[PDB]
């Protein structure tokens, strides 16, 4: 966390910095997309 790292979250490959998100995900949501289909946020498949 808080360090530029290559991440593969459940098959989603990418490069970026991971930070504790402060946006209220509803319990049935599993991804967050910004404009133009870019994955803004993702939930850890292990600790959720």
């Amino acid at each position: 966390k808080n360090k530029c790292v290559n991440f593969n979250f459940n098959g989603l490959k990418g490069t970026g910095v991971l930070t504790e998100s402060n946006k209220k995900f509803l319990p049935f949501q599993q991804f967050g997309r910004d404009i133009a289909d870019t994955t803004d946020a993702v939930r850890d498949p292990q600790t959720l």
Binding site: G11, L12, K13, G14, D37
Partner: protein, 49 residues
């Protein structure tokens, strides 16, 4: 926009497909995005006039 490609995200194309036929989809996406950027710059030049 998928520009006719399987997916609009490059990472999925590279992960799902091996280089041989993956390059075909990457070429399509790159051509589409180059065309869009060229159109953007052409419009910018026209408006700059």
């Amino acid at each position: 926009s998928k520009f006719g490609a399987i997916s609009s995200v490059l990472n999925d194309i590279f992960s799902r497909l091996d280089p041989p036929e993956a390059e075909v989809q990457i070429d399509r996406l790159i051509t589409g995005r180059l065309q869009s950027l060229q159109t953007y710059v052409t419009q910018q030049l026209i408006r700059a006039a």
